[PDB]
Amino acid sequence: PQITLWQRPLVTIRIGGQLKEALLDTGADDTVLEEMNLPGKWKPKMIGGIGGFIKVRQYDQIPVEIAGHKAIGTVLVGPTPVNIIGRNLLTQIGATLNF
Amino acid sequence: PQITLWQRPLVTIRIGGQLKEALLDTGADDTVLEEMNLPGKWKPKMIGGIGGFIKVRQYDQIPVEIAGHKAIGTVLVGPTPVNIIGRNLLTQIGATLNF
Method of elucidation: X-ray
State CA A36 to chain mean position distance: 12
State CA A46 to chain mean position distance: 16
Residue B91 forms contact with A (CB below 8 Å) = yes
CA dihedral A53, A55, A60, A65 (to 10 degrees): -80
> Does B1-99 carry CATH code 2.40.70.10?
yes
φ, ψ at A79 (rounded to 5°) = -60, 55
Q: Give start and end residues of each alpha helix (H) in B1-99.
A: 87-93
- Among candidates B27, B57, B32, which has minimal Cα distance to A83? B27
- Strand A84-85 versus strand A18-24 pairing type: parallel
Which amino acid does the sequence have at B8? R
- Strand B84-85 versus strand B18-24 pairing type: parallel
Map out the domains of chain B as residue ranges: 1-99
Interface subset of A 29-88, CB within 8 angstroms of B: 29, 48-52, 69, 84, 87
- Are B31 and B14 a contacting pair, CB within 8 Å? no
CA dist., res. A57 & res. B36, Å (int):
38
CA dist., res. B66 & res. B19, Å (int):
10
Q: Could you count the other beta carbons within 10 Å of the beta carbon of residue A48?
A: 11
- Are B84 and B23 a contacting pair, CB within 8 Å? yes
- Select from B28, B90, B98 the Cβ nearest to the Cβ of A2: B98
CA dist., res. B18 & res. B41, Å (int):
19
Instruction: Please indicate whether residue B60 is annotated as part of the active site.
Output: no
- Helix, strand counts (H, E) of chain A: 1, 11
- Select from A29, A91, A98 the Cβ nearest to the Cβ of B98: A98
DSSP state letter for B87:
H
Q: Across the beta sheet with B69-72, what order do the strands follow?
A: B42-47, B54-59, B75-78, B31-34, B84-85, B18-24, B10-15, B63-66, B69-72
- Among candidates B32, B46, B36, B37, which has minimal Cα distance to B74? B32
CA dist., res. B95 & res. A3, Å (int):
9
Three-class SS string for B29-44? Answer: CCEEEECCCCCCCEEE
Q: Using the Cα atoms of residue B47, residue B93, residue B22 and residue B43 in order, give the sign of their dihedral.
A: negative
Show the CA angle centred on residue A26, arms to residues A71 and A54, nearest 5°.
85
- Among candidates B77, B90, B74, B60, which has minimal Cα distance to B18? B77
CA separation, residue B59 to residues A31, A33, B7, B50, B89 (Å) = 32, 34, 30, 24, 13
- Are A57 and B61 a contacting pair, CB within 8 Å? no
Q: How many residues does chain B have?
A: 99
DSSP state letter for A7:
S
Q: How far apart are the first and last CA of chain A?
A: 15
Count Cα neighbours of A8 within 13 Å in the Cβ-side half-sphere: 13
